[PDB]
Amino acid sequence: SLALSLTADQMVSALLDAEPPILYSEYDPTRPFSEASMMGLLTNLADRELVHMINWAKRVPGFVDLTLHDQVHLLECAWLEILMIGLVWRSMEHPGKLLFAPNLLLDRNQGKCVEGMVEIFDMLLATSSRFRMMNLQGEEFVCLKSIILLNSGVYTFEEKDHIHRVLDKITDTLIHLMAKAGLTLQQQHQRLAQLLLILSHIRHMSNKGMEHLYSMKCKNVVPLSDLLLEMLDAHR
């Protein structure tokens, strides 16, 4: 594989260039929010982001080496985590707010508009607050997002060894970035751990958001796209 051959610097370069665009929501300020309409915004936005997420995953080193069935499984497993880490990342410089889109910046009080949503906004906000306190860097963020893609579904599986080799490469890359940034050896392993422990919180939020989404589907609050319905059914 060519992925295993990339240097740390080339890995970072590949991932930074593969970054998807920040998309706008179809938010309509002429109309007040309802539970249905706010859920409509988030799901319409998630749906459009998913398409870009797929192009992105194809550019994550090692991902194209897997079978279509393996690629499908990993993405089915990690899609909401990947959407949420991105949200938290772009919300970083907006304390107390979630930047779903440049035209859709919501505080916890707006989250209350949808039943059971505020709990999830609070977790997302706390995570953003954590990124802010750790001063997470863009190069670290892209590594973490790629780790989620490769790791979350990995134990729901040969080439599994391949995936672990790639994951090891991303670890070497994270360490390389922290060293380059001047962190002492002890600081490097301490930060690596702080960063990866966040992935447990991201997983938690994803599972809670999946259950919330399924609730909205089954209460007919909003129509999910066929793609969304498919991603969701992979979790039920």
Partner: peptide, 10 residues
């Protein structure tokens, strides 16, 4: 097949 499966190819 899934929609996801088709998008991965296109």
């Amino acid at each position: 097949h899934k929609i996801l499966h088709r998008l991965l190819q296109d």
